[model samples]
Target: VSSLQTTVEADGQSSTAEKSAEVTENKDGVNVVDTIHYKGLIPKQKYEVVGILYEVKDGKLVDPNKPITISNGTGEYTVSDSGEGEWKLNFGKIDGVEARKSYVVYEEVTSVENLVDTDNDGNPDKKHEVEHKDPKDKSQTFVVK
Candidate 1:
């Protein structure tokens, strides 16, 4: 089974939701999508925002067990792929937030790779590690409506 959770907030209002599902035989149906649809408190809210976790090692895709870390402008998250790694507004006293006047969530990978040589073939490659950019320039943004 796999699980996921996320939150989006701005002003003093917000929404948080989660889902978990079992793996299945059909390759096309092992996923879920979060939709950002609502009449927020105002127009064009900027809410703080926040994947799939699969790893590549030994020339193939592998599942990584270590937790991947990420952060929003207001908080940090230790999240790992739920049997999958692709991609979180997390952290803060979220309940205290009134939610958005706009909807924009931004985040960046903070950590989750350890250099490894899964092949043990006399050379080291980061095939077993999370492949991502440097923390300084990795933050990506999401705008929801």
Candidate 2:
């Protein structure tokens, strides 16, 4: 019998299936297979990914309401600000992953047109980014990252 393993990347983070599934004999009949138990994320238990946004358009914050998404083939979630430019996205943890089937996350603030001209500067060079897992992982807390 053979075993199978794969990787899952979510929110731009990548993790491998800590466990593998085994294959049985060929019965000379058509058959299909699926992982009996997905590993890595825990069921019912919560998991999280953290991020910080510092979109400074002409020295001002932008997309304060922007969303950071955490998704998998079976689920999805949103990460947002925590008063201190941090994104706290939460979800139910699950077992590890497969190719493409993963927990991907990231932040984007493309609403350059929405920046209010508080300074009337006519331009907003807003810059938003998430650093090396600002929370270095995910859990809880405003400005938690």
Candidate 3:
């Protein structure tokens, strides 16, 4: 009924990697987590995390249809949430070479506040838009590749 916070992460080697995002709500000052995970290849050898918030409207989910750009990196991959309260990785190509091994060891977070409650029924009824970031910062490096 309030705002939600989301987090995403990407990990991989030489232009190939894995990514994930998670959303959570605050109840009584405690964080409750709801998560979403996605995977795909990095076209143009570049990639970034895009988060969109969706809310139920008229008993059905309504898409805000806009994305918020969170993080950006490089690589080709498939990412999945392991159902262990977090998302998992299935990284693919690296430096134009197919990767035989992959693992995730990093994370990023995105937060949204004052989500629109169109119905005013004490619940948010709009999806937050998300997208990718260009010229990603050089800091926040988990591994040097």
Highest lDDT against the true fold, candidate: 1
Q: Report the C-alpha displacement of residue 4, candidate 1, in angstroms.
A: 6.7
Worst 10 residues of 3 by lDDT: 134-143
Query: For candidate 1, which ten residues in a row score worst on lDDT?
Result: 134-143
Alpha-carbon shift of residue 37 in model 1 (angstroms) = 20
Q: Each candidate: RMSD to true structure?
A: 18.4, 18.0, 18.5
Order of the predicted models by TM-score, top scorer first = 1, 3, 2
Alpha carbon lDDT at 59, candidate 3: 26
Name the lDDT of candidate 2. Answer: 0.25
Q: What lDDT is reached at residue 69 by model 1?
A: 26
Candidate 3 lDDT tens digits, 1-145? 2221223232221221232222122222211121223223221221223322222223222333422111222322222333112222222222211122111122332223334477889987654333222112111111211
Model 1, 56-111: lDDT tens per residue?
A: 22223232343122234333223322323222233332221111111222222222
Candidate 2 lDDT over residue span 1-145, tens digit each: 1111222222333333332222222233212111111122222322233323222223233343543223222233222232122222233232322222112222222221232344668964432222232111121111101
TM-score of each: 0.24, 0.21, 0.21
In candidate 2, what residue range of length 10 has the lowest lDDT sum?
A: 136-145
Residue 125 lDDT, candidate 3, scale 0-100: 66
> lDDT of all the models against the reference?
0.26, 0.25, 0.25
Q: Which of the numbered candidates is closest to the native, going by highest TM-score?
A: 1
